[PDB]
């Protein structure tokens, strides 16, 4: 069972945004589905639920009249249309499947969440620079992802084929108001001038992806 | 009285066999419950069945109390 | 419910039993559920319908719901159980979450940080910018001092350092960025990242 949320990004105060949740590995058409959100560093807050047939829909008081839940049983997908958004609405938005019956309800599967940032600041895509490669048999190389807004940025290596030894660090919020982060891989020193190393940086909120080749230092 | 909570617990226990027909008693000793989906609710999807509106209930006494 | 109250924080040592209560008007009539959330991850169901455990959850997690109080109890609390825990119930179709309870496991072993320092890349230098990147990983507890030196003297202007964040393995990570101009980078013989942790220090140096 997989729940994959999408659509998070920057929205101006008073603006609108549509989130999506694509479900896999179970009979979507037979479950009640929910949106739950979590502001940074704060607690979980239920947003909305929609029954299988879309007949029974409920909303938290905090969003009633501004948000619209919906589903396309066809594409095993759930949607959340948000309007008149405020800064208080900035949060990670989670898709969650309801289980149980007759008031004994719980959420047994959750997505990884999509981040919504409500701000009057402006989008900025990242500048990616190689961190060229030691510790005996292993060496460290990386990618610097500088000066982007909003969060988040995700980083893969060699298109997901390199997962071992990868450490993507939490981003720093600069004086700037922009974010920077670094991704580092511990790789064999035996293959620095042979193995191809490419960091795949995705910054969905600015519709930008960068595949940066990391080469041994000239 | 068989509590609503105890009835809800039983409905979740038999969530796969719950049907339009009366279920077995929920207890081996004491005052239990028998439940069925109301005839007027038989066509509702499973996730939309409501405890108050869609479930019929009836007390049943068992005495396996040794 | 319609207002669930958990304590903000619970602290125990390894091996002893952690107890988190969750209070609500008439909660005994409801079905309490519990979620574990580690930093940077989605919630995970650990107890549902008061007392039941999902298949893959260790036996040391247990739940109860009596009177108007639900309780999560972790027997033999391990370091891996450090996390935020949320109680949850249904009321009027409205889903109510407790405020969350952070469980801290006291007295875990110290772990010294690994430090990696990268100089500015030639591509950044060509774009008229220069950033030094100091990466600090796998330390515990999560309290560090990161300082920067230029030619052996303290540098503070232009430094941006994150708060330590919990890793996969319950250890902490942090990073520090020193933003320079290409002229400053070339002006000094060396730059250093000095990381002090529990009275011991690791210093890495780079030279243009």
Residue numbers in the entry:
A (entry chain H): 2 to 52, 52A, 53 to 82, 82A, 82B, 82C, 83 to 100, 100A, ...
B (entry chain E): 310 to 375
C (entry chain L): 1 to 9, 11 to 106, 106A, 107 to 208
From the study:
Here, we expressed and characterized seven monoclonal antibodies to the C-terminal domain of CSP (ctCSP) from volunteers immunized with RTS,S/AS01. We determined crystal structures of five Fabs to elucidate how these antibodies recognize their cognate epitopes on the ctCSP or αTSR domain (residues 310–375 of P. falciparum 3D7 CSP). Competition and crystal structure studies indicated that the antibodies target two different sites on opposite faces of ctCSP. One site contains a polymorphic region (denoted α-ctCSP) and has been previously characterized, whereas the second is a previously undescribed site on the conserved β-sheet face of the ctCSP (denoted β-ctCSP).
Fabs 234, 236, 352, and 1488 all recognize the same region on ctCSP, which is similar to the epitope of the previously published mAb1710. We refer to this region as the alpha epitope region (α-ctCSP) as it consists of an α-helix that includes the T-cell epitope Th2R (region III), and the so-called CS flap, which contains another T-cell epitope Th3R. Furthermore, all α-ctCSP-binding Fabs share a similar feature of utilizing CDR H3 to insert into the conserved hydrophobic core between the α-helix and CS flap in the αTSR domain. In comparison, mAb1488 exhibits minimal levels of SHM, similar to the previously reported mAb1710. However, this antibody does not make as extensive contacts with the epitope as shown by its smaller binding site, which is consistent with its lower affinity to ctCSP. In contrast to the promiscuity in the mAb234 binding to the Th2R helix, the interactions with that region seem to be critical for mAbs 352 and 1488 as these two antibodies only bind the H18 haplotype (besides 3D7), which has no mutations in Th2R except for L327I in the perimeter. One explanation for this intolerance for Th2R mutations is that mAb352 and 1488 have tighter interacting surfaces that would clash with e.g., the N321K mutation, which is present in most haplotypes. For haplotypes H36 and H92, which do not have N321K mutation, we suspect that changes in residues 317 and 318 may disrupt the binding of ctCSP to mAb352 and 1488, although it is difficult to specify how this happens without determining structures of these antibody-peptide complexes (changes in residues 317 and 318 do not seem to obviously clash with the antibody surface). For example, mAb352 and 1488 bind only to haplotypes H18 and 3D7, which differ by only a single amino acid in the Th2R epitope. mAb236 binds only to haplotypes H234 and 3D7, which are identical in the Th3R epitope.
